[PDB]
Design a protein around this ligand. Structure first.
Ligand code: 6EH
Ligand code: CL
Ligand code: CL
Ligand code: CL
Lengths: 99, 99
């Protein structure tokens, strides 16, 4: 699809048996989701943006479905104010910026 | 042009006659640049990021060129980790997300 930027680019995602709303974010290196349970081992990480840093749990090889496209990658879980789909998963669905 | 997301979508911008590097960020409602001098009056604005909120200076009707595309709009100045081109200016240059 072609997603305009007149509004925030929010999409429905499917992850760990849950349906969540998330923002397609080209400015984010990583995918960051609000607190939720995920399977497997995890490692702590600090991620920073505007306002400073937050502590998150890093889960690897997580299956996530975005607009019918199945993608696998690292998902960060923590106290983010908005669910973000970062470049690590956008590349997997073939997402590009065009102008 | 078409920009893939395997690397950060950093582009050259021109503002106040000077070249700077900025990130095309579909996850940002607004354009936020590192400390610099801009003409005229400014208004206060609070913007929220992954780590919390920051105070910035809002300047309106500012000429800014992005990849050679001329835009005139709102530019925020403050303590950002990187210069960010947000949706307010991405819409002016006809930028969309595609997959
Ligand atoms: C070590 O890598 C980083 O620290 N990466 C930062 C990152 O990906 N942060 C995740 C949230 C970004 C989202 C972006 N959209 C709004 C919600 O916040 C990243 C950064 C890039 C270039 C230079 C320094 C920083 C960035 C980018 C934008 C704003 C703030 C920070
Ligand atoms: Cl990944
Ligand atoms: Cl590709
Ligand atoms: Cl604007």
């Amino acid at each position: 699809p072609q997603i305009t930027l007149w509004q925030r680019p929010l999409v429905t995602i499917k992850i760990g048996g849950q349906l969540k709303e998330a923002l397609l974010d080209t400015g984010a290196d990583d995918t960051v989701l609000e607190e939720m349970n995920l399977p497997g081992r995890w490692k702590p990480k600090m991620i920073g943006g505007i306002g400073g840093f937050i502590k998150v749990r890093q889960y690897d090889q997580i299956l996530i479905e975005i607009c019918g496209h199945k993608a696998i990658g690292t998902v960060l879980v923590g106290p983010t104010p908005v669910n973000i789909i970062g470049r690590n998963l956008l590349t997997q669905i073939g997402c590009t910026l065009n102008f």
